[PDB]
Amino acid sequence: QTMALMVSIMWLCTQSMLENFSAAVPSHRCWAPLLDNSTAQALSPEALLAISIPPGPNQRPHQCRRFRQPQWQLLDPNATATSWSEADTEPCVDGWVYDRSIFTSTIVAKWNLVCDSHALKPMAQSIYLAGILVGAAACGPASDRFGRRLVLTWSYLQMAVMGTAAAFAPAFPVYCLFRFLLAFAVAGVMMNTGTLLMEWTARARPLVMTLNSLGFSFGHGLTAAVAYGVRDWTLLQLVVSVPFFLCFLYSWWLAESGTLLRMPGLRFRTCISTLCWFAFGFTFFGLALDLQALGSNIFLLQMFIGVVDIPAKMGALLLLSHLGRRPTLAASLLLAGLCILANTLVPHEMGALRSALAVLGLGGVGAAFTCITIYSSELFPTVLRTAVGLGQMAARGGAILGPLVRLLGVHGPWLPLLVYGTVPVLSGLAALLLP
Ligand SMILES: CC(C)(Sc1ccncc1-c1ccc(C#N)c2ccccc12)C(=O)O
């Protein structure tokens, strides 16, 4: 039944989207005796916060620097503000503290993922995406030798185990290994679902593809509701991996008891296919893992994209079945690129338009993925359509560089968004050349 796998793919989106909710960075500041010690001191907490922490970006108190001595210059109204020296700051010798405003417990507050060592979150995202990448390649021969159903049940068991274990990870490398194994199992489940849905009924390939895509997009609203319900990342991972226990228990019928040579050239087809897959994967896994910076509220943005991705994909399927594959794919790619470029150009003051443009770009890249998945079954002969596997591998490899590009934010907050807007434009400009 397609319902059982559709539910699993829905929770698979939840497990994939948990990389953004669990790695959320709430408002944090360094430990200070004027704010964290006893109230009896030798009033006005904002003044103490200002005199204890030097200002940083967006006129906010810095998150990785603290004054070695109380700077009373920010207290006297007649004093010249913004005139202290750099030597009066210390590299946070007393640690940091976290405010439980939007989130009460995350992996950032546990292992101290402050901006001083902010590379740990993109590194963990890249490790998860590498586990997704190597998961599809290794599960190929595993499903070919052991069978798709047995390895599917084993991947469900591994998903449950690594979900119940990641919530109890005491160290950062242990959590990274748990996420790697979880991503391996996720990639195995995805490959099995893909190889089963294609050979299920298919002329009915686009219908089942759109159904699976809608079941996956339901995962956005699912994880939004779960993150609005529970606020602890451990309890979140637990309740997200709980349904996979029943998914594994669904085994045994509910307790019954191809290589090619491209020496002359790229032949104008596989190069463009891999380029579009790379672009889709890169923009998707670079824009979905940083939803906190794309809108004012993470849950609101998630609900918005979850409620907009369904009619967007419906219209994408409509244009795919009504006016072809290449023109609608190029149009969706260009629309997503222009939307991300406008989101980059629009200042951070207008949050509503920013969230709308981000939702439109995500819908556009989803429509482009749907089109390139429908187009992958027609651009190659019946025996060459290895092509879909190569395209998925190229998309995963492009996703690998997704979180790594976000590290370029030290030079400017718009450069990652600039790339996320420029890549779809070139992808759509190159998509028009498809036969
Ligand atoms: C690696 C991906 C993008 S898959 C994938 C891997 C891990 N987390 C989520 C997805 C995913 C992303 C967008 C989708 C859409 N639309 C989608 C639909 C069905 C199953 C997975 C996804 C590929 O194969 O290139």
CA of residue 203 to ligand 1 center, whole Å: 23
Residue closest by Cα to atom 1 of ligand 1: 396
Contact 108, 121 (CB under 8 A): yes
- Which atom from ligand 1 is nearest to the alpha carbon of 193? 20
Instruction: Tell me which amino acid residue 190 is.
Output: M
CA of residue 316 to ligand 1 center, whole Å: 17
Ligand 1 neighbours by CB, cut-off 6 Å: 9, 16, 132, 190, 213, 216, 281, 284, 366, 369, 392, 395-396, 399
Q: What is the resolution of this structure in A?
A: 3.2
What CATH superfamily classification does 2-23+117-254+264-431 receive?
MFS general substrate transporter like domains (1.20.1250.20)
CA distance 106 to 161: 20
Decide the pairing of beta strands 28-30 and 66-67: unpaired
CA distance 399 to 403: 8
Residue closest by Cα to atom 24 of ligand 1: 392
Candidate of 189, 216, 240 to mutate for ligand 1, largest count of ligand atoms within 8 Å of Cβ: 216
Beta bridge partners of 89: 67
CA distance 89 to 101: 27
Tokens of 107: 């992996």
Dihedral (CA of 201, 206, 207, 213) sign: positive
Tokens of 435: 């036969």
Q: Mapping DSSP to helix (H, G, I), strand (E, B) and coil, where does residue 96 land?
A: strand
CA distance 433 to 272: 8
Q: Where are the domains of the chain?
A: 2-23+117-254+264-431, 28-37+46-98
CB atoms within 10 A of CB 13: 20
430 contact partners, CB below 8 Å, separation of at least 6: 272, 275, 276
110 contact partners, CB below 8 Å, separation of at least 6: none
CB atoms within 10 A of CB 183: 24
Contact 30, 66 (CB under 8 A): yes
Tokens of 272: 């463009």
* DSSP assignments along 349-381, one per residue: T-HHHHHHHHHHHHHHHHHHHHHHHHHHTTSS-
Residue closest by Cα to atom 3 of ligand 1: 281
CA distance 413 to 434: 34
Residue closest by Cα to atom 7 of ligand 1: 16
* DSSP assignments along 8-62, one per residue: HHHHHHHHHHHHHHTT----EEE--HHHHS-S-----HHHHHHHHS-B-GGGPBP
Contact 214, 379 (CB under 8 A): no
CA of residue 321 to ligand 1 center, whole Å: 22
Identify which of 330, 169, 316, 338 has the alpha carbon closest to the alpha carbon of residue 238.
169
3-state helix, strand, coil in the chain (%, to 5): 70, 5, 25
Dihedral (CA of 266, 268, 270, 274) sign: positive
Q: How far is CA 50 from CA 25, 35, 365, in A?
A: 21, 11, 43
> For residue 115, what is the DSSP state?
G
Tokens of 223: 């994880």
What b/e readout covers 334-367, taking b as 16+ CB neighbours within 10 angstroms? bbbbbbbbbbbeeeeeebeebbbbbbbbbbbbbb
CA distance 334 to 341: 10
Candidate of 190, 282, 314, 370 to mutate for ligand 1, largest count of ligand atoms within 8 Å of Cβ: 190
CA of residue 394 to ligand 1 center, whole Å: 13
Tokens of 30: 């360094």
Identify which of 301, 262, 287 has the alpha carbon closest to the alpha carbon of residue 398.
287
Instruction: For residue 427, give the H/E element and its range.
Output: helix 415-431
Q: Mapping DSSP to helix (H, G, I), strand (E, B) and coil, where does residue 76 land?
A: coil
CA distance 10 to 21: 16
46 contact partners, CB below 8 Å, separation of at least 6: none
Q: How far is CA 22 from CA 94, 290, 416, in A?
A: 25, 11, 21
Dihedral (CA of 289, 336, 317, 206) sign: negative
Candidate of 2, 13, 314 to mutate for ligand 1, largest count of ligand atoms within 8 Å of Cβ: 13
Longest CA pairwise span in the chain (Å): 84
Identify which of 224, 371, 242 has the alpha carbon closest to the alpha carbon of residue 307.
224
CA of residue 373 to ligand 1 center, whole Å: 11
Tokens of 289: 């893992």
Q: Mapping DSSP to helix (H, G, I), strand (E, B) and coil, where does residue 89 land?
A: strand
Dihedral (CA of 213, 218, 219, 224) sign: positive
CA distance 12 to 5: 10
What b/e readout covers 98-127, taking b as 16+ CB neighbours within 10 angstroms? beeeebebbbbbbbebbbeebbbbbbbbbb
CA of residue 319 to ligand 1 center, whole Å: 21
Instruction: State phi, psi for 89 to the nearest 5 degrees.
Output: -115, 150
Beta bridge partners of 61: 55
Total residues belonging to the chain: 435
Candidate of 12, 282, 373, 427 to mutate for ligand 1, largest count of ligand atoms within 8 Å of Cβ: 12
Instruction: Tell me which amino acid residue 77 is.
Output: P
CA distance 340 to 362: 9
Q: Mapping DSSP to helix (H, G, I), strand (E, B) and coil, where does residue 167 land?
A: coil
- Which atom from ligand 1 is nearest to the alpha carbon of 16? 8
